[PDB]
Design a binder for this molecule. Structure first.
Ligand SMILES: NC(=O)c1ccc[n+]([C@@H]2O[C@H](COP(=O)([O-])OP(=O)(O)OC[C@H]3O[C@@H](n4cnc5c(N)ncnc54)[C@H](O)[C@@H]3O)[C@@H](O)[C@H]2O)c1
Ligand SMILES: NC(=O)c1ccc[n+]([C@@H]2O[C@H](COP(=O)([O-])OP(=O)(O)OC[C@H]3O[C@@H](n4cnc5c(N)ncnc54)[C@H](O)[C@@H]3O)[C@@H](O)[C@H]2O)c1
Ligand SMILES: Oc1ccccc1Nc1ccc(Cl)cc1Cl
Ligand SMILES: Oc1ccccc1Nc1ccc(Cl)cc1Cl
Lengths: 229, 60, 60, 229
């Protein structure tokens, strides 16, 4: 009974989807964690059968999605959400979308899981180069793109079986310079890669859990097009 | 024409393996890292980029 | 008591993953790299060592 | 129709064996490359059932060894063998044990293969520290442990299908200093890791073949006990 939570899926054009698809070949149950801003658009296109084509695993296999929950990696617990987003149009009708809440939520309905995927990143000033990125934009990139991994781990470790595995997605811009990859995203990836090592020590020694990071090549994803450079 | 198109075009022309990189290419590798098949691998940065990262100087 | 015994005792005490490294652990990873599942990986050095390589300073 | 040639086996206590075991799980035909000096002893133990238990693939499966051939990685072609070995009691009752010769032999008997494993290493002065290693020992270590990979690729690429895969075994002593790993073995591994990158370029561009190297942790094997320090 393999259960995987994929955090960071807004459509079928990204890596989160290719991962989901491949996991299905091995018959693992998939739980999607969708960002609230695009949660309804995703659910809509899904119900209207606009993804049925993409859910084909060639071998007649139909992609089996266990659940689809709203999730925002910038909020650790319920009282971390600010009044503004709390009343925002796209958030008002949703609940239990913080990191702690989705962990508790998944634990109640399905119990312990054994696979976790961190497939998200965000940066307000990705269009500006490092030198011109503000402190606010920079810390926002790391808060969303890097710390969210540490947080997911801290909360999901309680609902994960021993010998479980965790992965995230990084980019080479962290080791070698690629102009255009701004807003502190290169910074966020360098941090994430270093944190993978440290977490690998703590998670391995205390929970006998593993964590690795995949450094992928270029893929024309929705967020990849955001990088106007 | 945005950073992404340049990166994709650059990869497909200079990587050791000249083929389009699919999301499922990363998917199967992710699948392996999540299974017990890799019980001895942890804390690593695994490159799935048709080997572009090993290059220093492009060809032409 | 021979180079290998020291390295192994050390690995099992300080590596992030405190488990015995079996030849089949390396075997399963080799198996994956030799299969088409890893078509996007080439020219890499993959570490199958329970993560010892990430350590700098030991606990004890 | 997968066939894998494993260069570097003398017993069931090393990495070559573990790799063979795991590959069998996936139904791949295995061909062992045995170093002439221990070839006959190996066949003896094989014939006397001394390896039978070690060939049981958990799931009631039996390891499927297609063939076993004498193989010496220090000889590229037939006219590379000197008198001293050409008259050695061991290499006498043997023929076709050079890299080019076994590749032709395999191609003739089984056709093309699509998997190659380089799992051999040797160093005359592995007991001495780098500073005290002679030019002779140092080169012998790089000849047997490093160049052998390049030669394997050069000759086997002709009997391999497109999209074939190659791997070798390396050790972290190449990147960080571990006292006791002498005789130029750390130097040879450093070269093997660099060559893997370069070969990846040539093999990937010209034949669409992949090559990687696995840096393994300690394992109590025969050649591992050989290291005295
Ligand atoms: N596309 C590439 O060329 C490329 C290359 C290397 C690494 N990566 C990494 O792949 C991962 C996925 O990116 P992708 O490129 O497939 O794009 P993607 O746009 O499909 O995925 C990113 C997802 O994160 C979600 N997101 C943003 N802020 C969030 C928040 N606060 N909480 C939760 N979800 C949030 C979005 O809905 C989006 O679906 C990223 O971590 C990225 O850094 C991508
Ligand atoms: N055991 C470890 O702790 C360890 C760690 C990291 C990397 N490695 C690597 O794993 C590989 C396999 O080594 P192992 O330690 O499992 O030992 P092993 O003793 O089973 O394998 C090495 C083989 O090389 C063969 N050999 C020597 N000279 C040869 C020649 N001229 N031609 C062909 N074969 C020849 C030997 O017969 C032997 O079987 C080596 O390349 C080693 O560097 C091992
Ligand atoms: O991390 C990447 C590397 C190359 C191309 C695209 C991405 N992804 C990305 C960028 C910027 C932002 Cl704000 C969000 C994401 Cl998911
Ligand atoms: O490469 C290694 C690392 C740690 C322990 C053992 C080995 N293998 C090895 C050593 C020395 C010699 Cl001469 C041959 C071999 Cl295969």
């Amino acid at each position: 009974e393999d259960i995987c939570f994929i955090a960071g899926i807004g459509d079928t054009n990204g890596y989160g989807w290719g991962i989901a698809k491949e996991l299905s070949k091995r018959n693992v149950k998939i739980i999607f964690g969708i960002w609230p801003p695009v949660y309804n658009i995703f659910m809509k296109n899904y119900k209207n059968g606009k993804f049925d084509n993409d859910m084909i695993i060639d071998k007649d296999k139909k992609m089996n999605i266990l659940d689809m929950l709203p999730f925002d990696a910038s909020f650790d617990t319920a009282n971390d959400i600010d009044e503004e987003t709390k009343n925002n149009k796209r958030y008002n009708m949703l609940q239990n979308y913080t990191i702690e809440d989705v962990a508790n939520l998944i634990h109640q309905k399905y119990g312990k899981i054994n696979m976790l995927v961190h497939s998200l990143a965000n940066a307000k000033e990705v269009q500006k180069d490092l030198l011109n990125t503000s402190r606010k934009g920079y810390l926002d990139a790391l808060s969303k793109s890097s710390y969210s991994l540490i947080s997911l781990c801290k909360y999901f470790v309680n609902i994960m079986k021993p010998q479980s595995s965790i992965i995230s997605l990084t980019y080479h811009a962290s080791q070698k310079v690629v102009p255009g990859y701004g807003g502190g995203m290169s910074s966020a990836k360098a941090a994430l890669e270093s944190d993978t090592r440290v977490l690998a020590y703590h998670l391995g020694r205390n929970y006998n859990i593993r964590i690795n990071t995949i450094s992928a090549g270029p893929l024309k994803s929705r967020a990849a097009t955001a990088i106007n450079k | 024409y945005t950073f992404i198109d340049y990166a994709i075009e650059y990869s497909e022309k200079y990587a050791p393996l000249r083929q389009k990189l699919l999301s499922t290419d990363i998917g199967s590798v992710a699948s392996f890292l999540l299974s017990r098949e890799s019980r001895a691998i942890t804390g690593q940065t695994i490159y799935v980029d048709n080997g572009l990262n090993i290059m220093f100087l492009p060809d032409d």
